[PDB]
């Protein structure tokens with residue numbers, strides 16, 4: 455089973471010039487927790503911006519080009535990336551936009567962080583049919599001294 459995890463601002467904005475604008479530590483803890491010990495699939499731009507493998511997870515990078523770092527597993531097709539994960543109970547797709555669009559139709563769950571921030575970006579999360587998804591978990595939070603924006607964690611499962 456494939457799951458997508460992403461943080462979205464107003465207008466499904468997910469990124470700006472290969473960077474996430476805001477500073478949401480509650481979000482990092484959420485991501486960590488949901489990704490720990492699972493394989494993660496990400497696109498080459500996302501890889502570049504992270505620069506080092508995420509620890510305690512098999513890191514699969516999708517690129518048309520030959521890989522350039524032996525610390526991670528390079529694949530060149532969606533199907534290849536799924537096959538590389540083996541038979542685990544859940545695969546985490548972590549971005550970016552081009553990647554999420556592609557995994558979407560195959561995904562069974564979404565973990566989203568809705569952030570109350572207004573920012574401009576060059577990338578947006580894919581527009582999904584809300585009728586196909588059921589919201590099974592949702593917890594809202596007010597900004598705090600650590601988190602400068604309010605946010606809501608949400609979990610959706612395909613019907």
Ligand SMILES: NC(=O)c1ccc[n+]([C@@H]2O[C@H](COP(=O)([O-])OP(=O)(O)OC[C@H]3O[C@@H](n4cnc5c(N)ncnc54)[C@H](OP(=O)(O)O)[C@@H]3O)[C@@H](O)[C@H]2O)c1
Nearest residue numbers: 460461469472473497498499500517518549550551552553
């Ligand atoms: N808000 C969030 O939660 C979140 C999570 C992740 C990322 N992001 C953001 O997303 C932005 C980057 O997204 P992006 O769409 O520009 O890039 P991306 O999806 O990270 O990378 C796309 C690249 O991956 C490779 N690729 C994609 N599909 C492929 C396929 N079927 N076969 C082979 N290679 C494939 C291609 O690389 P080649 O050019 O090498 O073929 C493609 O150029 C950043 O600003 C970042 O901050 C946000």
Ligand SMILES: [Ca+2]
Nearest residue numbers: 588611612613
């Ligand atoms: Ca059902």
